[PDB]
């Protein structure tokens, strides 16, 4: 149909376009590379072609698909690995003998090879149905049906034909819909453009616990179900590490991992590691992976795949939420997504803003976060779901004022830090309290108090300790440890202990084991207890030396507690933590008189 | 971390402060060490 | 057709529209000399070429253009070691010719097949600070961050030469079972540098071990960018077709980045942060993506890029970008160099986040990783104490701090201090490392698991 | 030929310019001003005209010279002051009654009044002769090697006409060469474009030093021919002195002095001073100037000549390298050559990189360093010659963290730190052992050990002793010198003699700033033997006061070492040092016992 | 604001209008005009950013004949945490004083966490009842 007028860089101009929508997907040239229409100048439409071009001729054919860059939502997304332009990566390996994308491959959006078992819904013939309703379900996992087959949004009618229970393939018809005669047939998959968010019934308040399973978050600033999060940091920050832990431990029923332009070895590691390791609520065959789907993309792999990653992933997440699942979406990193834009603004010749990144940055990040939150699912059964977004970014040389980090921080309500100095001693991730806040902290403590722990009371003293520690440390540096008071010495020690035992997730035998809110609470009871009794003791006359040497064993025990597997009496209160409480009491008394 | 606009005004006066202060602290140390040598000898006597 | 005009490294051709992107063209000068270039931008009845070779002398209707009608691919053979080549797709040194059994593209996806399975095999440099504190794997990417007062070439050569002697000791251990190949590419460095490198490889072993691509600073920036691409084709073939582990030493990586910077200055392309391109991310990526295990899973390409920092800052765009992408960071310090430590590698900010992938356990200890973390932690405390020793004096520092100041001094002068040909096995390094840990008491070593400390002390 | 389309500033565009190369020398207008075509857009050539384009209407003719802008290489270089694109300043003084060259005044690069005596080589008609082979020579010097005439590089053939012995003019033909009909005629000079490096048989690394004749250069970190070196700027209260002294004391076969874009006080000083001063090896006929060829630009000269300045000088240096000579290129300053690039960029409209300096900067420096170095000279019986670049890089932002300095140091392997406080007090040179380095040390120290000196032992030890002295000096301030051993006091005592004799040399006296490379080694020998013996003797029972009285005469000699003559029987073995050694051994038995 | 003018003037209401968040308004200004003839000012923020601002401030103030008022409390978020940045800087010149928050109190845990040292209103003495 159209004919290539020019290729200047990855940017292609082709005449004989009478139309085309925004960001319309095309297959360009005989090669059949990915593209999207960004703009139209005259009859000539400028289309960026984002798969590497080293050999596209002028006057090669241009085929419009007729709809924007879109995603399929349907059966077999779980335990199936995809790119950001929704090509199954497994399908490519077999055919192509190119494990990664080579230049010029056209592989359909889903797997049309794997038959799936369809069972019929509470909607039988003659019944009205509307988008996001559970028309049926597909068995995908050993424990649960993952993919609840939804009628798509922006479709409606009464069902003339319901296919019976049995096996069918993806392209075969299984549903016929009545509304102005045959409105159309439906297939197992449905399509949606990824620049349109999916519509919900209502959004609902975020105040319900999100257990990410990592001690350091639970202790300092927990997230919420419905959360939005920013995390900075630059290599040796433990972001890959916290993703793997996050996937294993996560209470959410789906986790969607987004690789924005990753090392490739990093993607190779996490893929291998989900079936090698076991889940905490049990998992039969590829345990963790059963709950994990990967969108993975490397650093030179298509600029479209990388740009679309956050939208392909957020659309997936919204679909699981409309299904009635709790989703934890990890994107890593939005900063690598931001580089895809920096590149897009130069090529096109549009004028950018500061740091050579465009101004449209701020809108695009904001749109992604607002589609997240906790909501009541669209569809007649009605369920509760969430999309809680944890989004990684990277500072430009210790500069946190770079447009990407500042923008994400603008939109977020939770900020979790990352300190370079503390990572060097091996404490990554490294969250303090002067580089981090959470608005959810206040409601979240109220909900944890209820469940069992004393957390809110301990949280306040814990915050104070860290806040004083920093200030007191500046005096040690400059003046020396000769200007201190004895209570201030106490604040320094307890603090050093907190730094190691929560923030560090680095091994010494084994990478640290699942620590819940309950575990995390016990650690806090022992550190806070140490501090109170010791200050009383010094106030009331007593040696510093006597008190520190005496705590001794108790300190070794809390350090290593996290390596030991949870439950050692109970999850709730361990016998190992219970006993220390007595030891402090016995010491306090010896010291006083 | 820090402002990207007009940190130069506060920082410039600090920097000067520091090198100027350092020079001056050295003179106060030099005087203190100056007297110290003298009294050590006088005290033994 | 004929040259229309020339504006810097960009050449304006008035031509006809049949050419494809990166299709080779040859510029015929009136001297009858041919130089090669590839079309960077094509439009109707005209082209913009960037010429690899030269950038001046280009005429109008006295000059002519001829089309090759093949977009650039590198002629790759597996008989490339020992053979001298020049960074231009052919030797202009008059060295043994390249030959071709495949011609492979440098776009960054020819047929590219990489890691679906992460590195697990340890590869040693014979140097303790590298191996123990960070570890190197059969796909690991580690940047050598160097300076204008450090001698970058001496360290570059040091790491490579000593990793060739260790690597067959590791073959016998059954860490490996396949060949080792070196691919050395020097791009746009001085003559003095080029000569030096060749001399170094000969002394240690031979130059049969390595393949050489030589590019001279007097040759353009456009040449310099193609120079690593040539290295990548060499390495991917060897891994793919003949199940060899390939080690690439890419010097200087900074040289390549400045080149990118020049084709946005004498272009109308608006640059990003600190005058370095906006599409700088993609240019760098191309080198780093083409790494890891190669299909069959006995072949590999492992990367050690060599960066020289000009300002020596960690706010400069080149060191920052590289670091996020690469699997490790090795920081080499001017202050150690001055003091008389060779190698003078500071591990204070050397970190790997893919620390697990980097270490080995089936041809290295399991204790290797546990000890390294503790060492790093104890080094760091020893640095905090060093600043405090200058300020406060010894007139208030604590009993615990004193142990940490001693550890710091013993650590620089024994562990990081090694002979020019003295190679240490990874197991022997543990014994050395255990000597360093041994002065601290069992209550200072509290962070480590009890099992390990009672076992090995 | 072409017709002027526009004159917008000093940039002039011209149409109807075909077969116009991209380095093409052109003469603009009726006046014939020098210009060169930087760019071409279409039919129109964009020219930077270096001279004032005042009086130039649109429609004036543009006449191609028919070839790039080249420089002439041949007889009658030495004892001439030149422009940045080689135009004799001296010749303008005769004609014009001007120092400088004013607009509309051009002249040829070599004088045609002067005639030189051409002597044939070892090739006669009918012989095949090859690129660079020695076709003849001219002798016009007796103090140094003269201008040996080569067959032009990249030129081969059989010689139809070899002119016999006699005087010919530089202009006049002396060769016709048969290579595809008459190849052309050639003359006594050859033209070479200066933005093209000259070939040589092969280039090698450096290994070969020569007489620097400034003690501090050799002693602290050796000075090598075929080297790359950075020297700090001072803007003529410190810069000028070291430059004048390096030209005068170094008895390198040639010296090529390039002032890139200087104050004009410094240019004025170097020209008047060179005939006035005496050679350090004997001979008259304007001593130092006869060895010197000068390119002298103040900042006032055209900007293309300032940019060109180093390129022309480097070609000059490279030409003499094929004759087999050792050259010092002393260039001052690269920051000022860099300033030209910045100016030329803004005029074109080129977008630069950091601090306003282009991106052509880093590659142009790398290309520049490599032209300089050691090489086996081209020409049939082969010789060795060198080109050593010492380039000053001054403040360009008021710091040394600016792009010009930071780029160069990296390619450079040598830094020599001038000291300001000592420089303001007029000790020149006074190099700081703290900041300085040479990466050439190793290969060189091995070279001198071969030749006859004990050089590796003494140089290394020189450095250690001084470094050590700063650290011991601090123990004297804070604890006291009295509580410290005799050994430590000695370490300092010796460092002060090493500092006084070498480092604090005065380039206003020739018995205090001119001594041969052997002589400089003999002095250093003297101090080291004393250090060891002094520490040996205090251990066997001596005191600082006792030691000082006892050494006496040898200590006084070493203090007086610099005042001594460059010879005593030879200028390579100074008999007074060899006998001093005996007096030291005899003194050590007496002192110790 | 047009709606506030209706109530304040026709039916004599005291209107307090809260306009949140001015940072989102400011950003919008930058993204537009990357394809008009008009071409942004200082740091990619419009030079005519001031004109935009002033259109919002136009419909605020006391009303003639003293039927009602519109009072306006805008909320600005400093994105770089400096007031030398465009959003606080241009806005601050128009505005009759400013109340600037405090980062330090917040960390402590205080609410509302503002500070009084950067906060000043010039027309304070004459205005009040």
């Amino acid at each position: 149909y159209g004919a290539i007028y020019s290729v200047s860089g990855p940017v292609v101009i082709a005449e004989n376009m009478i139309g085309c929508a925004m960001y319309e997907l095309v297959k360009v040239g005989h090669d059949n590379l990915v593209g999207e229409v960004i703009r139209i100048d005259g009859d000539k439409a400028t289309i960026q072609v984002y798969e590497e071009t080293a050999g596209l001729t002028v006057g090669d054919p241009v085929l419009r698909t007729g709809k924007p860059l879109s995603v399929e939502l349907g059966p077999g997304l779980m335990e199936t690995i995809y790119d950001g332009i929704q090509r199954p990566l497994k399908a490519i390996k077999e055919e192509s003998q190119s494990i990664y994308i080579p230049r010029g491959i056209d592989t359909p959006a889903l797997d049309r090879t794997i038959k799936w078992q369809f069972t019929p819904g509470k909607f039988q013939v003659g019944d009205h149905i509307s988008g996001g309703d559970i028309y049926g379900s597909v068995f995908e996992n050993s424990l649960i049906s993952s993919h609840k087959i939804l009628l798509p949004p922006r479709s409606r009618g009464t069902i003339t034909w319901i296919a019976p229970a049995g096996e069918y393939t993806l392209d075969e018809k299984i549903l016929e819909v009545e509304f102005d005669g045959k409105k159309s047939d439906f297939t197992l998959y449905h399509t949606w453009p990824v620049r349109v968010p999916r519509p919900v019934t209502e959004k609902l308040s975020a105040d319900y616990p999100l257990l990410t399973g990592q001690r350091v978050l639970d202790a300092l600033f927990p997230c919420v179900q419905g959360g939005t999060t920013c995390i900075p940091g630059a290599f040796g920050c433990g972001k890959t590490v916290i993703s793997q832990s996050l996937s294993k431990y996560s209470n959410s029923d789906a986790i969607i991992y987004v690789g924005c332009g990753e090392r490739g070895n990093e993607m190779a590691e996490v893929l291998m590691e989900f079936p090698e390791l076991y889940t905490e609520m049990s998992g039969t065959k590829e345990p963790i992976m059963k709950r994990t789907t990967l969108v993975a993309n490397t650093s030179n792999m298509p600029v479209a795949a990388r740009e679309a990653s956050i939208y392909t992933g957020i659309t997936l997440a919204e679909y699981f939420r409309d299904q009635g699942k709790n989703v934890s979406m990890i994107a890593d990193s939005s900063s690598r997504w931001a580089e895809a834009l920096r590149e897009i603004s130069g090529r096109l010749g549009e004028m950018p803003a500061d740091q050579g990144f465009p101004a449209y940055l701020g809108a695009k990040l904001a749109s992604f976060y607002e589609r997240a939150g906790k909501a009541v699912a669209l569809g007649s059964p009605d369920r509760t779901g969430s999309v809680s977004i944890v989004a990684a970014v990277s500072p430009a040389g210790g500069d946190f004022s770079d447009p990407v980090t500042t923008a994400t921080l603008g939109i977020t309500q939770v900020f979790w830090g990352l300190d370079k100095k503390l990572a060097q001693r091996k404490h990554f991730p490294s969250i303090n309290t002067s580089v981090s806040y959470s608005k959810y902290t206040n409601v979240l403590n109220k909900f944890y108090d209820s469940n069992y722990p004393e957390f809110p009371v301990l949280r306040d003293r814990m915050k104070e300790i860290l806040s004083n520690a920093e200030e007191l440390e500046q005096v040690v540096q400059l003046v020396g440890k000769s200007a201190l008071s004895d209570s201030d010495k106490i604040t320094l020690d307890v603090a050093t202990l907190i730094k190691e035992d929560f923030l560090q997730q680095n091994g010494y035998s084994t990478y640290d084991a699942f620590c819940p809110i309950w575990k995390t609470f016990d650690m806090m009871r022992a550190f806070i207890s140490y501090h109170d009794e010791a200050q009383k003791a010094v106030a009331n006359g007593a040696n510093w030396s006597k008190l520190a040497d005496s705590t001794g064993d108790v300190k070794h025990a809390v350090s290593s507690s996290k390596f030991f597997e949870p439950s050692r009496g109970e999850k709730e209160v361990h016998g190992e933590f219970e006993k220390l409480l007595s030891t402090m009491q016995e010491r306090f008394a010896e010291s006083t008189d | 971390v820090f402002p990207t606009r007009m940190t130069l005004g506060l920082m410039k006066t600090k920097l000067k402060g520091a090198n100027q202060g350092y020079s001056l602290l050295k003179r106060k140390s030099e005087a203190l060490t100056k007297r110290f040598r003298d009294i050590t000898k006088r005290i033994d006597d | 057709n004929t040259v229309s005009g020339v504006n810097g490294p960009l050449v304006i051709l008035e031509k006809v529209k049949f050419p494809r992107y990166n299709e080779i063209v040859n510029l015929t000068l009136p001297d009858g000399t041919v130089r090669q270039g590839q079309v960077l931008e094509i439009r109707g009845d005209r082209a913009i070429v960037q010429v690899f070779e030269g950038t001046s002398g280009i005429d109008v209707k006295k000059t002519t253009v001829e089309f090759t009608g093949e977009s650039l691919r590198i002629p790759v053979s597996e008989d490339m070691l020992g053979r001298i080549f020049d960074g231009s797709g052919r030797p202009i040194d008059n060295g043994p010719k390249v030959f071709a059994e495949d011609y492979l593209d440098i776009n960054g996806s020819p047929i590219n097949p990489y890691a679906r399975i992460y590195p697990e095999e340890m590869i040693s440099t014979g140097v303790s600070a590298i191996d123990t504190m960070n570890s190197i794997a059969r796909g690991q990417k580690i940047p050598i961050f160097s300076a204008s007062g450090l001698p970058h070439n001496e360290i570059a050569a040091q790491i490579c030469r000593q990793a060739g002697l260790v690597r067959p000791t590791k073959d016998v251990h059954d860490g490996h079972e396949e060949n080792f190949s070196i691919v050395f590419a020097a791009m746009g460095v001085n003559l003095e540098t080029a000569r030096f490198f060749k001399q170094d490889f000969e002394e240690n072993g031979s130059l049969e071990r390595t393949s050489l691509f030589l590019n001279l600073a007097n040759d353009p920036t456009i040449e310099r960018i193609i120079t690593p691409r040539l290295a990548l084709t060499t390495a991917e073939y060897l891994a793919y077709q003949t199940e060899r582990h390939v080690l690439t030493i890419l010097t200087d990586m900074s040289s390549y980045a400045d080149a990118l910077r020049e084709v946005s200055a004498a272009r109308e392309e608006v640059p990003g942060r600190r005058g370095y391109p906006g599409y700088m991310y993609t240019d760098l990526s191309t080198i780093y993506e083409r790494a890891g295990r190669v299909e069959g899973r006995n072949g590999s390409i492992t990367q050690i890029p060599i960066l020289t920092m000009p300002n020596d800052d960690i706010t400069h765009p080149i060191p920052d970008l590289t670091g996020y992408i690469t699997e490790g960071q090795i920081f080499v310090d001017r202050q150690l160099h001055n003091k008389g430590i060779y190698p003078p590698i500071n591990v204070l900010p050397s970190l790997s986040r893919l620390m697990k992938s980097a270490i080995g356990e089936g041809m290295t200890r399991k204790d290797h990783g546990d000890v390294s973390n503790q060492l790093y932690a104890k080094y760091a405390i020893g640095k905090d104490a060093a600043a405090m020793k200058a300020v406060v004096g010894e007139e208030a520092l604590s009993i615990e701090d004193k142990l940490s100041l001693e550890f710091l001094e013993k650590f620089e002068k024994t562990f990081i201090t090694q002979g020019a040909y003295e190679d240490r096995t990874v197991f022997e390094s543990l014994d050395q490392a255990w000597s360093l840990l041994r002065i601290y008491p069992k209550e200072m070593l509290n962070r480590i698991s009890p099992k390990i400390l009672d076992e090995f002390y």
Side-chain angles (χ1 to χ4, degrees), chain C residues 27 39-40 126 198 213 269 290 310 338 351 370 383 424:
Chain C
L27 174 41
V39 293
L40 215 297
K198 284 178 282 192
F213 281 104
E269 301 185 288
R290 291 170 69 177
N338 295 132
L351 273 154
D370 301 0
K383 294 295 183 178
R424 275 168 177 182

Side-chain angles (χ1 to χ4, degrees), chain C residues 45-88:
Chain C
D45 317 278
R46 71 194 304 184
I48 309 289
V49 186
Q50 277 186 8
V51 297
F52 310 147
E53 294 140 303
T55 191
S56 186
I58 306 176
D59 304 87
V60 202
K61 289 289 183 63
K62 313 298 203 308
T63 35
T64 49
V65 187
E66 282 295 86
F67 304 161
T68 299
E70 191 46 82
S71 67
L72 185 63
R73 297 180 81 102
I74 308 309
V76 69
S77 273
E78 64 179 55
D79 291 278
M80 308 277 272
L81 315 180
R83 293 200 311 200
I84 291 150
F85 295 129
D86 200 267
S88 60

Side-chain angles (χ1 to χ4, degrees), chain A residues 69-378:
Chain A
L69 176 59
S70 288
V71 74
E72 285 311 297
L73 285 329
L77 295 162
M78 301 310 211
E79 298 182 302
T80 297
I81 169 166
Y82 291 109
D83 301 290
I85 38 179
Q86 196 87 341
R87 280 189 176 132
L89 179 69
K90 43 166 76 154
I92 283 178
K93 301 182 194 157
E94 291 177 7
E95 288 182 293
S96 318
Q97 305 194 289
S98 290
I99 303 289
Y100 278 24
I101 311 180
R103 196 194 163 300
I105 179 69
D106 196 345
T107 303
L110 295 177
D111 285 305
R112 326 293 178 179
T113 44
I114 304 173
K115 306 195 52 174
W116 303 116
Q117 178 175 278
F118 183 69
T119 171
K122 48 182 169 293
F123 284 83
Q124 302 304 119
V125 285
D127 292 301
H128 190 262
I129 198 164
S130 297
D133 294 30
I134 306 182
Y135 168 75
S137 58
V138 166
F139 284 89
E140 186 68 59
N141 290 175
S142 300
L143 296 187
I144 53 163
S145 274
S146 286
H147 307 127
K148 296 187 182 65
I149 296 198
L150 313 175
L151 182 77
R154 297 180 190 168
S155 192
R156 215 139 297 219
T158 189
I159 58 186
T160 166
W161 174 252
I162 194 159
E167 308 304 304
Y168 290 91
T169 331
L170 296 77
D171 304 90
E172 302 187 76
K173 55 168 186 182
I174 44 166
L175 167 53
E176 292 175 39
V177 167
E178 178 165 312
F179 187 68
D180 299 275
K182 190 157 268 58
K183 182 177 202 283
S184 47
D185 307 305
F186 289 81
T187 51
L188 282 71
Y189 52 71
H190 49 89
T191 203
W192 193 250
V194 290
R195 308 302 298 194
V196 177
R198 284 172 70 93
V200 301
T201 301
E202 64 171 34
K203 293 297 202 87
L204 187 65
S205 300
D207 52 299
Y208 299 100
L210 174 89
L211 174 52
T212 55
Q214 297 173 57
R215 65 284 325 151
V216 59
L217 308 182
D218 288 42
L220 308 147
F221 291 102
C223 199
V224 73
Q225 283 179 288
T228 312
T229 319
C230 184
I231 317 174
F235 223 72
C237 30
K239 285 179 177 298
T240 187
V241 182
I242 56 166
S243 296
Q244 187 273 110
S245 288
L246 167 54
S247 189
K248 185 158 73 298
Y249 297 148
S250 48
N251 67 309
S252 277
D253 310 285
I255 172 154
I256 175 67
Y257 177 67
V258 186
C260 295
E262 306 290 89
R263 283 63 270 163
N265 300 101
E266 194 159 76
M267 315 286 82
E269 208 180 303
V270 302
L271 185 56
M272 175 67 52
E273 279 183 290
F274 304 152
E276 292 185 291
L277 265 141
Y278 200 77
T279 327
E280 316 301 296
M281 62 294 286
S282 320
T284 291
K285 186 186 73 280
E286 311 173 286
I288 326 185
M289 198 175 184
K290 278 195 309 86
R291 301 201 279 105
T292 316
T293 173
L294 310 72
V295 164
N297 287 284
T298 51
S299 59
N300 191 74
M301 251 156 65
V303 176
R306 277 196 264 143
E307 188 275 284
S309 74
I310 60 159
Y311 293 110
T312 294
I314 199 64
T315 302
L316 282 157
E318 290 178 86
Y319 169 54
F320 294 136
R321 193 179 55 192
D322 309 307
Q323 303 184 14
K325 294 192 197 302
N326 294 309
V327 189
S328 39
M329 178 181 188
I330 170 60
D332 187 53
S333 305
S334 292
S335 59
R336 302 305 82 184
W337 171 99
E339 304 283 79
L341 307 192
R342 195 174 67 156
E343 288 163 56
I344 287 181
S345 196
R347 272 158 186 165
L348 297 182
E350 60 171 69
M351 47 176 284
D354 294 329
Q355 288 207 8
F357 288 98
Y360 283 72
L361 177 66
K364 287 184 163 151
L365 284 166
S367 295
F368 175 42
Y369 301 132
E370 290 196 283
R371 296 170 191 199
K374 171 158 292 312
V376 201
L378 182 63

